[PDB]
Design a protein around this ligand. Structure first.
Ligand SMILES: Nc1ncnc2c1ncn2[C@@H]1O[C@H](COP(=O)(O)OP(=O)(O)OP(=O)(O)O)[C@@H](O)[C@H]1O
Ligand SMILES: Nc1ncnc2c1ncn2[C@@H]1O[C@H](COP(=O)(O)OP(=O)(O)OP(=O)(O)O)[C@@H](O)[C@H]1O
Ligand SMILES: Nc1ncnc2c1ncn2[C@@H]1O[C@H](COP(=O)(O)OP(=O)(O)OP(=O)(O)O)[C@@H](O)[C@H]1O
Ligand SMILES: Nc1ncnc2c1ncn2[C@@H]1O[C@H](COP(=O)(O)OP(=O)(O)OP(=O)(O)O)[C@@H](O)[C@H]1O
Ligand SMILES: [Mg+2]
Ligand SMILES: [Mg+2]
Lengths: 485, 492, 74
């Protein structure tokens, strides 16, 4: 044809954005990865989504797994392929070998198979084809050049037939050659690499479109997660800087704080509370989560530092009854150890639950605990993710950060998140006469005026009481002022 | 079946959590690793727990070790296979070669072996199968493709038989290919990798479930230990943030402290005492452990810096008789150099002893010492483990930390654990008039009010005496203050 | 000895034969092997590791021009 290469949607979450529309129609895409990366799942979801969203029949050619198994496995994702096979929308071509045995039936090899796939295609009026582990086929006794030819032959016949195909390969090195024979890379029109990178005893699945002959696509690796719903990719670099921005205000749950912020936090905003350990970030969170219930709004408190029970003990000791918020179905507590997941996973759990609960407010107690282990770059990527999501969803977000050093801290954040944030509330210890008092300061607020004082404050059962500034002192920021008389 | 694959529990501690229930029934799981990683043990424990806990018979196929040796080595874990063989619950089928000699044993091999296996399975009504090192079978003269097919044949036949199987393979590189031929990884539906990673000159064993076709499972490496009870895995990432939390108070063993903490520590709480060397952390510990005996409760003191003798000399000089606490069976001391093991080992020793003694209190004198060498992330993982165990078990825990720099310390912890802790007790030196005095502060307390004073304190034979704050000083925290006040008293 | 002209599988069989006969005889044996890399495969043919009951690795590590010998029971 005379125009811009057309793409078939995969409907696999996030993939069509990365690929700028989908898989190129009528050509085949190589998808390779090491064991357990999700090659098989990709290729099934491509067919399954075809059938269920466009009523495009599919043909799935298997060389190793058994059709019963392919069917059985899909149940993991709540997909009835046996039904689809019955309705004639899906046809699983069994090309696996005889557990029993013979060695002279496939002397007509590529040729013959190519005929059965063409027969199947015509028969079911198939639009999508997935060949699972072509690699395993020549893993009979071949050399690079022999593979290059067979692959080419196949790709080509399928091109003639007009089918959009997904071919699956295996690799042994996460960052080594693209597929086993260092030859499939160049014979396909498109290449997709699925990686399961190790790094620190944790595993991180990343998808990459290495090339799409004829169109554009997003470059590099994007994290993804295999879940009950199959492959889920987050193109964190594909999120646009187009979030809605209002002037409406909301309370912090602490009136005086609201005053200092020139009448409260903005609804559309990301508020950061940083401070040495024990300064009271968690008390603010409690208070901010409570204010959303007293106004009959839903709030989620994602806790990564304290148990659901402890959170309740400490909250109740500050007034506020978290128990009720729970029943009233106005407040939802989560709680998990940063270590019980990858940032990718965490991010999704968060999104996920936000979707099931549709909160108005959200508080992540200790981003600084989520940064444990992870790389700064991996972590920043996470923050932009949760932040950006809350921002585009009109949810007001309160995030917490504990600074590594009490008193004398020379930066707002050790991970340098300040700037991705709209409002920064700052808590610090101040040594006043052999005692450790606290001080709160609205450091910055983007669309408002806010107070510039570093007010001292106390914590009682009643909660946070913000008092006055240390007017008669110098170097209050050092943590060790110098009362000047 | 219209159901997603079901799992068989291995009962191997920690494994069913990592594998979300067990191994997939009717399929085979490839377990591979280098020499001495624990392959053979995993497979034996899988059959053993199969028989002892569900009365599911097992067939163990062996290609290299002798049935007598497999039975003999299992005695290391208190397992009498010879008995089970006897009662027809376990059947070791010997597939090893005879120390004499025959050629061309590749063909009939698989097939014969397969019906030998089928025969045995059918014969004993086996539900579980372990094939130990299939690897060694084609290690007769083969190339990758021949391996791939043979494997496939075998797995397949077993699938047909309906057996849940554990297959074992060797590797030569800790992070190299999954299994010798670089082919087994793909033919198997499930793959488990046992690693015995070096580093320092210490070795750390990890288990990873790489893939389970059909279901979910935890990802990554998990440290485990081989013990007299076999493989023991700690899914430190599977521990849930659901610990019970009470408002009950308990004493620190120092009244004045108790006041400062708004009436003593919380029963449910992790306490951290920090400060430069010689401050008084060990003193606080001793006192905290004694307090649990004087109340006839059990306490364990895990010490990593002092001998059991030294602890006793120093204690007695502070009053408190550790001798009695011992006899009375209320106090138990441990002691061990951080270097005499890996964090994984230590964590387990701690847990183990907490189970045999059921303490109400526990103190680890110096986390800081356990951090010697180990990486920060390995360490933090350790702390969350001991910390969380303590917490879900309602045991009050006091941990100690020596800061790397006396005076001027700009962070509570050098390893940044402060966040993983409920109450923080800070000890510091204060230079006052050419002399080194001490100060104690309750830096933070999660559920109470605590005192914000940086009180000076002394240490005598009576123990710790907490005096008053340094009100007329600026830069207390810095360790080197400055006195103030420029108006004594004059006329009108 | 097999450094005469052999491949991995031939070595595994021969070793196994020897070790086996020795165990029958009732003897407690120490068998020595060479390696070329201080941290690579355990022994030459990457096969002796699994054929023996116990494995001990003697290392002589370089690192900064000094040499440090270590013994490990693997
Ligand atoms: N419901 C599920 N929830 C979460 N993870 C799942 C679920 N089902 C399967 N998985 C995961 O997905 C993986 C499946 O990968 P998959 O079968 O797609 O093919 P593959 O890894 O590409 O290739 P191979 O045929 O070599 O195994 C499993 O290893 C497992 O980690
Ligand atoms: N009932 C109470 N009465 C007086 N002060 C209290 C009370 N509860 C807690 N506090 C004070 O508040 C502090 C608790 O801090 P908070 O739980 O708000 O979290 P944080 O400082 O933000 O974070 P983290 O606890 O992880 O360091 C304690 O140090 C203590 O001084
Ligand atoms: N009771 C025990 N206590 C602690 N460690 C044990 C004890 N018994 C055995 N071990 C350890 O476990 C190891 C046994 O490993 P195992 O026999 O399970 O198989 P392998 O290493 O997987 O394979 P192979 O030795 O056949 O190459 C020993 O090397 C030893 O380190
Ligand atoms: N009988 C005593 N009388 C007066 N002071 C004592 C007595 N015993 C110990 N001390 C003092 O207490 C200090 C001992 O410190 P302690 O045993 O409390 O542990 P630490 O400071 O926490 O840790 P570490 O000893 O490893 O540095 C000595 O430096 C000394 O000044
Ligand atoms: Mg907190
Ligand atoms: Mg000490």
């Amino acid at each position: 044809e005379h125009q811009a290469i057309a793409k078939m949607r995969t409907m696999i979450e996030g993939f069509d954005d990365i690929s700028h529309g989908g898989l190129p129609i009528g050509r085949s895409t190589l998808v390779s990865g090491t064991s357990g990366t999700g090659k098989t799942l990709f290729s099934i979801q491509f067919l399954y989504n075809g059938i269920i969203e466009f009523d495009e029949p599919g043909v799935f050619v298997t060389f190793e797994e058994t059709p019963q198994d392919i069917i059985k496995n899909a149940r993991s994702f709540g997909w009835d392929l046996a039904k689809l096979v019955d309705e004639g929308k899906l046809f699983i071509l069994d090309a696996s070998p005889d557990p029993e045995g013979q060695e002279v039936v496939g002397g007509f090899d590529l040729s013959a198979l190519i005929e059965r796939i063409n027969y199947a295609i015509q028969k079911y009026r198939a639009r999508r084809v997935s060949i699972d582990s072509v690699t395993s086929v020549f893993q009979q006794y071949d050399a690079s050049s022999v593979v290059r030819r067979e692959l080419f032959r196949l790709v080509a016949r399928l091109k003639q037939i007009g089918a959009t195909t997904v071919m699956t390969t295996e690799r042994i090195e996460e960052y080594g050659p693209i597929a086993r024979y260092g030859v499939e890379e160049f014979v396909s029109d498109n290449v997709v690499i699925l990686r399961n990178v190790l790094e620190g005893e944790r595993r991180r699945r990343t998808l990459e479109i290495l090339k799409l002959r004829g169109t554009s696509h997003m470059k590099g690796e994007y994290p993804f997660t295999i879940t009950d719903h199959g492959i889920n990719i987050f193109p964190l670099g594909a999120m646009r800087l187009t979030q809605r921005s209002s002037n409406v205000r909301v309370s912090s749950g602490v009136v005086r704080l609201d005053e200092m912020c020139g009448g409260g936090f903005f609804k559309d905003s990301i508020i950061l509370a940083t401070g040495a350990t024990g300064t009271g970030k968690t008390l603010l969170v409690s208070r901010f989560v409570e204010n959303a219930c007293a106004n009959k709004e839903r709030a989620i408190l994602f806790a990564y530092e304290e148990s659901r029970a402890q959170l309740l003990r400490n909250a109740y000791s500050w007034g506020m009854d978290f128990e009720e918020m729970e029943r009233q179905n106005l407040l939802k507590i989560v709680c998990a150890y940063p270590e019980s997941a990858g940032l990718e996973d965490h991010l999704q759990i968060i999104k996920s639950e936000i979707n099931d609960f549709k909160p108005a407010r959200i508080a992540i107690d200790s981003l600084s605990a989520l940064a444990r282990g992870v790389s700064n770059n991996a972590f920043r990527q996470f923050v932009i993710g949760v932040t950006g999501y809350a921002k585009q969803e009109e949810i007001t977000g309160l995030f917490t950060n504990t600074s590594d050093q009490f008193m004398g801290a020379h930066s707002i954040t050790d991970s340098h998140i300040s700037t991705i944030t709209d409002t920064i509330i700052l808590l610090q210890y101040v040594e006043i006469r052999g005692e450790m008092s606290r001080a709160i300061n609205v450091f910055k607020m983007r669309g408002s005026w806010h107070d510039k004082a570093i007010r001292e404050f106390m914590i009682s059962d009643k909660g946070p009481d913000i008092k006055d500034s240390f007017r008669n002192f110098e170097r209050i920021i050092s943590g060790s002022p110098t009362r000047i008389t």
